[PDB]
Structure 1
Amino acid sequence: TVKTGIAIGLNKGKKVTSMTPAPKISYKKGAASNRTKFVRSLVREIAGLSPYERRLIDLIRNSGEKRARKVAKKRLGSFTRAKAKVEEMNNIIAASRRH
Structure 2
Amino acid sequence: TVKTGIAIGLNKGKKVTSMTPAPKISYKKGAASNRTKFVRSLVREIAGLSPYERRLIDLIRNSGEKRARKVAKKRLGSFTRAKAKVEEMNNIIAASRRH
User: Could you state the TM-score of these two structures normalised by the residue count of structure 1?
Assistant: 0.95
- Residues in 1 aligned to 2:87 and 2:19: alpha-carbon distance in whole angstroms: 40
Give the Cα–Cα distance (whole angstroms) in 2 for the partners of residues 57 and 93 of structure 1.
7
Cα drift, residue 11 of structure 1: 1.1
Alpha-carbon shift at residue 97 of structure 1 (Å) = 3.3
Taking the aligned partners of 2:14 and 2:60, their CA distance within structure 1 comes to 54
Q: Percent identity?
A: 100
Instruction: Please give the secondary structure, in 1, of the residue aligned with 2:5.
Output: coil
Q: Separation in 1 of the partners of 2:45 and 2:7?
A: 59
The structural deviation recorded for 1:54 is 0.4
Alignment of 1:35 onto 2:35: yes
Map of 2:95 onto structure 1: 95
1 CA distance for matches of 2:92 and 2:45? 11
CA distance, structure 2, for counterparts of residue 46 and residue 18 of structure 1: 51
User: Segments of 4+ in structure 1 off by > 4 A?
Assistant: none
Structure 1 unmatched ranges of 5 or more: none
Q: Secondary structure at the match of 1:85?
A: helix
Q: State the distance in 2 between where 1:34 and 1:97 align.
A: 25
The 1:61/1:98 distance shift into structure 2, 3 A limit, reads: farther
* C-alpha distance in structure 1 between counterparts of 2:98 and 2:64, whole Å: 16
Per-residue CA distance 1:16-50 (angstroms, 9 max, x = gap): 11112111000011211011100000011110010
Q: Which ranges in structure 2 are unaligned for 5 or more consecutive residues?
A: none
User: Superposition RMSD on alpha carbons, in Å?
Assistant: 0.9
**SS of the residue aligned with 1:90?**
helix
Shift of residue 98, structure 1, vs aligned partner = 4.2
TM-score by length of 2: 0.95
